[PDB]
Write a protein of this length. Structure first.
Length: 156
């Protein structure tokens, strides 16, 4: 296989030394799979913090979008990986990126009940008044979902 297909595979699987190698030997850091996912997307999704650091150090596009408009920060926020959320934000991730449904990382964290993530996104400039395409804010999702603590952080 092409260096980029391997990198995607390695990233998803958490193979740190294999990702480290591929990058040192010129694999496309932003290689795309069938749905537009990059290595970064996959590492952020599957919780591979070390691979996220490696990728970012080798110039990964921190704000890459897949076919659904989903960024690595959306995945890290949705799936609860607070230390990856922190790292991505420190590397210039777009805190208010909207996916195809209009959801920001904040909306995704609110949907999934991730409080410490909500608190960290709000700390780095998340737009608490952002409406998704359904016309709802992160708060409204909290109410519908039924999350008292999160409903509460969102309205301080
Ligand atoms: Mg991002
Ligand atoms: Mg983003
Ligand atoms: Mg946000
Ligand atoms: Mg927001």
């Amino acid at each position: 296989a092409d260096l980029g297909k391997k990198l995607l595979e390695a990233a998803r699987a958490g193979q740190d030394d294999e990702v480290r190698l591929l990058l040192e030997h010129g694999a496309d850091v932003n290689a795309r799979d069938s749905i537009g996912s990059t290595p970064l997307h996959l590492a952020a999704a599957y919780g591979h913090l070390e691979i996220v650091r490696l990728l970012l150090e080798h110039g990964a596009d921190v704000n890459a979008r897949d076919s659904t408009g989903t960024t690595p920060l959306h995945y890290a926020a949705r799936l609860g990986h607070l230390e990856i959320v922190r790292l991505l934000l420190e590397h210039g991730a777009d805190v208010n990126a909207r996916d195809a449904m209009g959801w920001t990382p904040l909306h995704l964290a609110a949907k999934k009940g991730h409080l410490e993530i909500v608190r960290l996104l709000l700390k780095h400039g998340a737009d608490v008044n952002a409406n998704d395409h359904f016309g709802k804010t992160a708060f409204d999702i909290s109410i519908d979902n039924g999350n008292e603590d999160l409903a509460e952080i969102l309205q301080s």
